[PDB]
Amino acid sequence: PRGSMRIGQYQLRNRLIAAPMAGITDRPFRTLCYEMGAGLTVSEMMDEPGIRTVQIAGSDPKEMADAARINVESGAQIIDINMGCPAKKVNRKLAGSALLQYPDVVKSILTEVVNAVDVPVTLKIRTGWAPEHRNCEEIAQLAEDCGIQALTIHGRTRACLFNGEAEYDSIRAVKQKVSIPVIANGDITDPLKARAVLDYTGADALMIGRAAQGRPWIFREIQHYLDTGELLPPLPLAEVKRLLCAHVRELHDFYGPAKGYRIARKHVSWYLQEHAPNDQFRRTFNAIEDASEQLEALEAYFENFA
Ligand SMILES: Cc1cc2nc3c(=O)[nH]c(=O)nc-3n(C[C@H](O)[C@H](O)[C@H](O)COP(=O)(O)O)c2cc1C
Numbered sequence: 001p002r003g004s005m006r007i008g009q010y011q012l013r014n015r016l017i018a019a020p021m022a023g024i025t026d027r028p029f030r031t032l033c034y035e036m037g038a039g040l041t042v043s044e045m046m047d048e049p050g051i052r053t054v055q056i057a058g059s060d061p062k063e064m065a066d067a068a069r070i071n072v073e074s075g076a077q078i079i080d081i082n083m084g085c086p087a088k089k090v091n092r093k094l095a096g097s098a099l100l101q102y103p104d105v106v107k108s109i110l111t112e113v114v115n116a117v118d119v120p121v122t123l124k125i126r127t128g129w130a131p132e133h134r135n136c137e138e139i140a141q142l143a144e145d146c147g148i149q150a151l152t153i154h155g156r157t158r159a160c161l162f163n164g165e166a167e168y169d170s171i172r173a174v175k176q177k178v179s180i181p182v183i184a185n186g187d188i189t190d191p192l193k194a195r196a197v198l199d200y201t202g203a204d205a206l207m208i209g210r211a212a213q214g215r216p217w218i219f220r221e222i223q224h225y226l227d228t229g230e231l232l233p234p235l236p237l238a239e240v241k242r243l244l245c246a247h248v249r250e251l252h253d254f255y256g257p258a259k260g261y262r263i264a265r266k267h268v269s270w271y272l273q274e275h276a277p278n279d280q281f282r283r284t285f286n287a288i289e290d291a292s293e294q295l296e297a298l299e300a301y302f303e304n305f306a
Helices: 027-035 061-073 096-101 103-114 136-146 169-177 191-201 218-228 237-253 256-275 280-287 291-302
Strands: 005-007 010-012 016-018 040-044 053-056 078-082 088-090 093-095 121-126 151-154 182-185 205-208
Touching (some): 016 027, 053 061, 061 078, 061 103, 078 103, 103 136, 136 151, 136 169, 191 205, 205 218, 237 256, 256 291
Parallel strands (some): 040 053, 078 121
Antiparallel strands (some): 005 010, 088 093
16 A cells, blocks of 8 residues: 555545445444444444544535534544435435536535535545446546545446446546545455456545445455455354344344344345345244344354354
C-alpha cells in the first residue's frame, strides 16, 4: 500500500470497505464485519466500529445538506452520498443513480453537502444511467471539483441492475483522470478476484457487499492475500459455529428475543444460501419461532460434521 488508504485526515487500517446495504447492514452485522477484517463499514442515515461512516440519500441539495449536518451532530465522522442505487426513492422522488442522468443536480447536491459539514464527504456512484450513457469520468471530475474526498464506483450502470458482470474498465479510466482515492466495487467475491481488480484498476481500496452476507470473515481472507500473497485456509466448521452462534446471541440482545429471532433467521439464511442452499436444515430453521430453539438447532446442525 502506498501510504495506506485515506479518506481526508483518516487513514484506514486496510483497503477493504464493507458496502452499505439498507436492511442488511445493521449495527450487529457492521460490527461483525469490522471484527472480521473490514477497514471501514458504512451505515444508513436516520457508538459504531472504527471510523463512523454514515451514508445519506435524497435528491434535494438543501435536504441533503441537513441530513449531512444532523448525522454529523449524531456522531458521523465521514458522510457518504448515495448516487448508485438503481431503483431508490427518497421522499417519493427518484434518487441514487437516477441523479447521474443530470450533472447539474449532481453538482448542486455535492457542493451543498460538502460546505454543510466540516467532515470528509465521499460519493458512491455507478458507471452511468445506461450502457449508452456512461458519464463516469465526468461525474468523478465534478465530484473532485465539488470537494468530495473519496469516490466509490460500482462497475455497472443503473440499467445493469444486478445483471451480467461488473466491469473494471470505467473504474480504471476514472482512477487515471482523478486525484482523489477511488474505491473499486462490484463482484469482488474472493481474494484472487480482489487482487486482479486492484491490479487492473489501480484503485485505492475495494468495496465488498453481497459476498460478506454469508461469509463476514471474507475481509480478513482478502486482506491476508493482498498483504502476504498467501491464502488463509478455509474457516473450519467448528469456528464457523462459534462465530454464527455468537452473532445470533448478539441479535437476541439487540432488538430482544422477539424481533431478534426474525433477524437471526435472515442472517443465518445468508450463511445457508452460500454454504448449503438446497438443504434440509434451511427449511426447518426458517420454521422456528423461538430464540432459544434457534441457538439449539444451530449447534445441532454443526455437530453432524464433528
Ligand atoms: C440488498 C441490497 C441493499 C443495498 N443497499 C444499498 C444502499 O443503501 N446504499 C448503497 O450505496 N448501495 C446499496 N447496495 C449496493 C451494494 O453496495 C452493491 O451490492 C455493491 O455496490 C456492488 O455489489 P457487490 O455486492 O458485488 O459488491 C445494496 C445492494 C443490495 C444487494
